[PDB]
Structures are given as structure tokens and as C-alpha cells.
Amino acid sequence: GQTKPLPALKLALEYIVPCMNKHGICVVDDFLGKETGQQIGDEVRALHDTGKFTDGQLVSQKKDIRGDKITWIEGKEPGCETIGLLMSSMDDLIRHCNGKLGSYKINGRTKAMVACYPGNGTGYVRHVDNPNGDGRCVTCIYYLNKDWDAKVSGGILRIFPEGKAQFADIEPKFDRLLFFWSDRRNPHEVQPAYATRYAITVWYFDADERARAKVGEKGVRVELNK
Ligand SMILES: O=C(O)CCC(=O)C(=O)O
Ligand SMILES: [Fe+2]
């Protein structure tokens, strides 16, 4: 009634850029609205019911690392149009930011990794997303879990910013967008989840680090949506 969305340019330049450059972590709640976030949840639940997910441990393994299942979504597939819209919304924010996030020049991204922690106390041990300079500079995560209560269901993303006297507890709440630097500045872990936990991750590529990267689906650079 009295509420209005912030335009992407404003959110980007007045909040995301300052917050990232000071803290290396930035949370945006109510990113897309209830209607759209509910539609994303249905599409992700469809992918799961219909059996499109692959054990994350298979992807990462050579010791148990991660209890999640996953699938990569390009954005344009049948029953994935709203994930496509999500990805375009993320892209619009980054475009407005680009130039002003450290000295990175972002020239692309991965496809969307839709991930599912199927309850049963599953999670992801402490890790750095990009420890060996594979080109990914920013991790962007969108959560879609209605009425999530970490007291009961756990599933917290805990981030340990390198050499800071602080840490961050990020709850995977419905319609929350999360940005953090993908490198060693931000080791993090998904703590045990006791309900079904959904999340959609995209990583953004720095043009320079990417070009110099040494010889997965994490390695494909798509152009940003217009
Ligand atoms: O779902 C999350 O909160 C983070 C998952 C994660 O860190 C990863 O899959 O690399
Ligand atoms: Fe991660």
C-alpha cells in the first residue's frame, strides 16, 4: 500500500556497492516480491519432484563434503522462465555495480546452480568457493524457503570473513538475495538442515582473473542478460 521497489540502479549504487566494498558481504531482503518468489519455489520443487537433481558429493568428490543435490539451469528451459527472470534481475544489479566492486571488471557469469538440502541434517563443510583463481569474483545466492525457522530447521549459512573480528549468520529466508566475494576472503559453511532447503547460486566472472585461469560447469562464462 505504501511500499515501492527500489530501482536496481539505486539499490546497486546506494547499498550494494558500499556494503560489498566495506564488508565483502551484502544481504538484500524482499528482492523480487512474494508472487515471483512463490513461483520460483514451484519451478524448483517441480525440478525436484521430476528427478532432475544430481548428488553434489558426486560433482565435488575425488571424505564427505556436501549433502546437497543440484542441477544447472540456463534460464530458458520449459518450467524455468521465472528462474530466468531471477537471473535477469541479478544481472541488472551487477551491471549497475560493475566498475565499482573492487577493481573487478565483470564480463559474465555461470549458469544458475539450483541446490537442495533434503533435510536429514545435511549441509556443506567449510570451504572457499574460488580458492585457486578460477575467475569467479562474486557469489550471488537467492533463497526461496517460506517460513524458514533456523531454531527448528537449522540450515544457516555461516560466513567467516578472513581476518575480521566478526562472522555472519545468514538464514536462508524466503526472497533473500546474498552477495559475497567468492575467494579466500570468505570461507563459509552450510550448517545441518532438518527441513528441505532450496537456494539458487550464480557466480560472476572477473574478465582479468578468468583470462589467466589455469585449465566443470562452474567454468562456463555466459554473457549477462540485457
Ligand atoms: O546454500 C548456501 O547458503 C551456500 C551453498 C554453498 O556455499 C555452495 O554450494 O557453494
Ligand atoms: Fe559455497
Swiss-Prot record:
Fe cation binds at residues 127, 129, 188. Binds 1 Fe(2+) ion per subunit. Keywords: Acetylation, Congenital erythrocytosis, Cytoplasm, Dioxygenase, Disease variant, Iron, Metal-binding, Nucleus, Oxidoreductase, Phosphoprotein, S-nitrosylation, Vitamin C, Zinc, Zinc-finger. One of its GO terms (biological process) is negative regulation of hypoxia-inducible factor-1alpha signaling pathway. The modification S-nitrosocysteine is found at residues 19, 26, 116, 137, 140. The keyword Cytoplasm applies. Residues 105-206 form the Fe2OG dioxygenase domain. GO terms for molecular function: 2-oxoglutarate-dependent dioxygenase activity; enzyme binding; enzyme inhibitor activity; ferrous iron binding; hypoxia-inducible factor-proline dioxygenase activity; L-ascorbic acid binding; peptidyl-proline 4-dioxygenase activity; peptidyl-proline dioxygenase activity. 2-oxoglutarate binds at residue 197. Disulfide bonds: none annotated. Its main location: cytoplasm. S-nitrosylation inhibits the enzyme activity up to 60% under aerobic conditions. Chelation of Fe(2+) has no effect on the S-nitrosylation. It is uncertain whether nitrosylation occurs on Cys-137 or Cys-140. Changing residue 97 to A: Little change in enzyme activity. Transmembrane segments: none annotated. According to PubMed:11056053, widely expressed with highest levels in skeletal muscle and heart, moderate levels in pancreas, brain (dopaminergic neurons of adult and fetal substantia nigra) and kidney, and lower levels in lung and liver. According to PubMed:12351678 widely expressed with highest levels in brain, kidney and adrenal gland. Expressed in cardiac myocytes, aortic endothelial cells and coronary artery smooth muscle. According to PubMed:12788921; expressed in adult and fetal heart, brain, liver, lung, skeletal muscle and kidney. Also expressed in placenta. It is an enzyme of class 1 (oxidoreductase). It is linked to Erythrocytosis, familial, 3: An autosomal dominant disorder characterized by elevated serum hemoglobin and hematocrit, and normal serum erythropoietin levels. This is Egl nine homolog 1. The gene is EGLN1.
